């Protein structure tokens, strides 16, 4: 009943994924392989020690030049930058977690399947429009085992789509805009240096850095009713994890702050429990670190102007919360496996 | 003889509260090629040692190129010009009558109502300019480039509003003039300030209590409602919040307004460039380069529109992103408002 | 057998102390009161949420206008800035934890005893030379219940004294100097602003800030053989917790790095277990956050030049590690109580 | 005629690697009132768009006051002076012979041995100056103010050492001259650099792999041993470590040496002031004000002794604390060493 999982790209998301999976009380996933350069010494070290996750409580050991163990469970470590040379056939790999960011299209991602894997889950927006995209709590019931390659979307779309779905259900969105005030990521430079994006080129811990986001338009992938309704931008700021979405939408049904928050609470207590949370305490970004939910509505910041302009402020741990959804989506593929 | 040359006379200025705004104000004023302002006194608890040191060395502004010296025990000099340093927590005890002080720059954040700011006038000064929103609703508020032409010498106590309101009101004025505003909301992603705690510690605001360089910290702002004090057609139309982030200066306003006239991003930016090239030159700027927050440090304008970020959704929802150096840019406006009072003096 | 404890000054150390005490498996301490301004709402909120400690797992509730509860145990909250008005007599206060920093002399600290307390433990260097000073792992066996006012010294002395004691035992110190590269503290300003010390006046998160330290000379209080042998300075850097001591000493007995590290390991495995730790992994400051030990020797950084110049690099969580020693010292007073 | 005026001729310079040091070097050179250097080429993968943008806008240095323009598709201009932008990862393909390049500034951190740096000479250049320690032990190393008088035109490949060695060696030279060094150790509390990771990520050095703006990060340094390359009497006498901390520039060396002659803090500082006022003017500075790291940004000297921190324990253990802007100060020395090669050319 368990499925055999391989992680491709042991970066922030790959390592978050493992630690999220290892913390699961009950799981249908058996992680047997990690493809990554740097090898057993980097993989074991960076899995154990983490500047934002903290020290992993599990026993992490280097078994030999191609294996690590986590609390005694051995994991093969491989190290090939080109996917076509991966031993997924020999290792009977069921599902590949694609966390490199590099192979996000059918040609790139499909290479895992050629080398033996049956299914690929991309931890990022797909470049191709023919790769289905899912957000747990929104449209994961639409997933079918017949899909060989799937996308769990971006961390920002996973924050936005759950509370946008509630807004569309209760009040109806006409159009809107969003800004995510977002922790810096590994894509940005530490000091001013080469980058395709001249804003991301600038020292990340010193600056507020505007950058494009696809998340506002990507919401229409999991909520078709949102097509063309939203746009937005990102502001990268000098924090290492936890981000916040600032959404302003014009709604169909005139309303007020407590009625909007009531809708979120109803979803949080029912169909979106564990995915959407409504926070009533006056907190700051660090308080939402390592929260399992995709979205935490900051209830006291909800604002309605002129009856139909609604402003919602939503916290999300863009690393840990997203990785829990990657685990949730992988567990869906396992429970649907034929 | 035939005639004398025209002589605009200089008003005598005292700075009360030699903090970030107080010291920014001094450096902004000292850099002006022309001024009608003669800064003759500073009220700092720390005496000449603190005042000279913190004026010279600045972690945000960098080192002051001017020659700063301790002349004696109650005076410093800036490029040879001496300034008296007084040290009184109570404005009633300040020697303004003795020093013939015309205008007081209130930068303590404490004497922000008629009673408190009025103590300077009881002490001998003629006029008080509060570098903050006034707590008193009958205290007139001005934003240069927006409504400073409504200033009158007969106002003894005036407010230069908040730094966020000074960024917001200029480009909101253009939006209201050209397209008309129905309603709107904003968020300012704002550098941390001295009101925030370095490590989690006591604060009336439980979010401002949290470590400022570690967190995104939501806090209230009156700046969106305050716009209506300088643009009365906007009463009840704007609200917003602030998000304090771990940078030491420069902030950015993100405004979303529903407008009456359907428009598009290039038409909105064209309206800003029109204002920037004409009536709002030096106050409002339109930036075309792909810059980040640090690039707007020590910029003299109140507002820098990030033109590439302008968005319009569904014809009448306009999103505008505007940078502002909340310390230097605001302080240049404090100098400008003080110059208005000098030009219209008596 | 338990003693009744009051905490004066619910700041970083006061709140760290409570959370350290609440985590103790077995304790002789019963914390019944906290004297502090801001009252139940600040005290409950800042006890629950913490930017470096993280969220307190215990249930923290506001019972009424003068009480909070931690997992159901009620704690009276009082709020008087002058110690003389404290109800320690009425509350039968045995021991006061002095964490304000303001009352560090017999006149200041003794005011607690006048108002009813029997003993005062200062969480800082004493201003007076007649107030005995103790460092757990070094000279806590010299404490006597007859001492009404005691000092647990500074966080830097608690890092330095344990491994300095080993160095003096094994090799003999002639003279030395230390620099602590230290996280910023609440004494520093966030932005350039008024301060008695014009260096501490400067923006703390932007700067390397030199400042004086008494810790090098304070070591002679708990190790008399060190009198006049050490001096040093502090460099405050833009991290919120965890610091590192860089000690260079000339020693009597010529030696080498592995022999110096062997001495530390012997103490760490024996008489200084739980106080001194020798770290063999290549770690960074965040990895030592919330470590219970006073001192973590970074073994691979130990260096010996010219046979008798020894350089030792020691990590310490200046908040959590120090607070565990404050708890350890308080537990000593309880076990010695007559 | 009687005579011609004396004409020191300018050598033609190419910058390879337009990073922090490459761009600092350009801005340092452009600010010189006199120079024998004519920078005619830059090798940047990013083409004119990147080069012009990152030269103009700098999060550490601030905005470049000079006029920076894209002239065409292979040239930028700086105050009207054009500079060719080439884009070749392989130095063997660079057009140095075609461009008559005399000297190449190697600031890639890659071509640091005779083979790699020698590729520029195969490509047509005459001499290579590595802005880093040379991996090759026969590559001569120079520190201005210490041993640049031993430089010879007949060296085709030279090293300007590391930024820490440039801070250390000047004030170590004074200590050795006046008191004599037995042995010593140091720690540099150092700003983070581009070799460190923003978030925990892959790195050969498991400590440099850790998030740079969040941590105190110990790392190895050859700078203490490297002093012996420019001061041979110091061979085997110094070692040390580095502690990377969350600041973006400016670093501080903390040196503890046992000396032969018993001394005291004022006598040590007097020795530094002697050097600072005479043979090491412009290289070594003695700071008396109580400053912090940011105050030493964009200081041209290699070393600033924090005089109040000088300590002597037990007569012969001297502790010295010295500030250095590891980007700007070092780059001014790169310009200085390049000027030495120009002055002694052929
Ligand atoms: N960080 C976040 O907040 C989130 C990011 N994501 C997505 O997750 C993905 C990774 O982001 P993140 O993990 O943050 O960035 P990281 O750089 O931290 O992870 C990247 C990892 O991929 C590895 N890698 C790169 N190329 C290859 C290759 N050819 N073969 C094998 N391994 C390779 C890198 O190893 P090396 O260092 O050796 O190149 C690195 O360990 C991206 O698609 C990103 O958009 C989505 C949601 C959350
Ligand atoms: N910083 C910003 O971005 C902007 C702030 N403002 C406003 O400007 C004002 C100051 O802000 P800022 O300068 O940033 O904060 P600061 O704390 O840096 O300035 C405060 C100064 O006031 C002094 N002070 C306080 N009380 C008294 C008193 N009773 N008598 C004399 N001096 C006193 C303080 O001295 P001590 O330290 O000795 O108490 C300190 O130097 C506030 O009203 C703020 O809202 C507006 C726009 C921009
Ligand atoms: N932080 C560290 O790393 C360590 C610090 N220490 C020592 O611990 C002590 C506290 O340091 P820290 O806790 O960091 O600084 P904090 O400011 O965080 O703690 C100070 C607390 O004392 C309270 N306080 C101040 N005056 C009074 C008063 N008159 N009556 C009652 N409560 C008062 C403050 O409340 P309000 O905010 O209302 O004034 C604040 O909560 C100092 O002596 C320090 O030297 C020693 C080792 C570790
Ligand atoms: N930063 C400091 O404090 C100091 C550093 N140094 C030394 O200076 C050198 C550079 O340091 P720094 O400038 O800080 O690091 P940077 O990475 O900022 O400079 C590196 C530059 O080299 C370019 N580059 C890399 N490989 C090549 C190549 N094969 N061909 C052409 N260009 C290339 C990079 O471009 P891309 O980004 O496109 O790869 C980048 O622009 C290093 O040797 C360093 O040790 C010495 C003293 C001071």
Author numbering:
A (entry chain O), C (entry chain O): 1A, 1B, 1C, 2 to 18, 18A, 18B, 19 to 34, 36 to 60, ...
B (entry chain R), D (entry chain R): -6 to 1, 1A, 1B, 1C, 2 to 18, 18A, 18B, 19 to 34, ...
Paper text:
Photosynthetic GAPDH is an important enzyme that fulfils major metabolic functions through its participation in the carbon fixation pathway. As observed in other GAPDH from plant and non-plant sources, the crystal structure of CrGAPA revealed that the catalytic Cys149 is located in close proximity to a histidine residue (i.e., His176) crucial for thiol deprotonation and thiolate stabilization. Like in other GAPDH, each CrGAPA monomer consists of a cofactor-binding domain and a catalytic domain.
An additional structure of the enzyme complexed with NADP+ and showing the catalytic Cys149 oxidized to sulphinate/sulphonate (-SO2−/−SO3–) is also reported. The superimposition of the two independent chains determines a root mean square deviation (rmsd) of 0.21 Å (326 aligned Cα atoms) and 0.30 Å (335 aligned Cα atoms) in the case of NADP- and NAD-CrGapA, respectively. In reduced and oxidized NADP-CrGAPA structure, the well-defined electron density allowed the building of the whole non-cleavable His-tag (MHHHHHHM) at the N-terminal end of chain R. This portion disordered in chain O, breaks the 222 symmetry of the tetrameric structure which became a dimer of dimers (C2 symmetry) and is stabilized by interactions with symmetry related molecules. Best crystals used for further diffraction experiments, grew with a protein concentration ranging from 5 to 10 mg/ml, 1.2–1.6 M (NH4)2SO4, 0.1 M Tris-HCl pH 7.5–8.5 or 0.1 M Bicine pH 9.5 (only for oxidized NADP+-CrGapA). Inspection of the Fourier difference maps of CrGapA crystals clearly showed additional electron densities attributed to the cofactors (NAD+ or NADP+) and to an oxidized thiol group (-SO3) of the catalytic Cys149. The reactivity (i.e., nucleophilicity) of the catalytic Cys149 thiol group is ensured by the interaction with the basic imidazole ring of His176 (Cys149 SG – His176 NE2 = 3.3–3.4 Å) and by hydrogen bond formation with the backbone amino group and side chain hydroxyl group of Thr150 (Cys149 SG – Thr150 N = 3.2–3.3 Å and Cys149 SG – Thr150 OG1 = 3.9–4.2 Å). This evidence indicates that the catalytic Cys is prone to oxidation just increasing the pH of the medium.
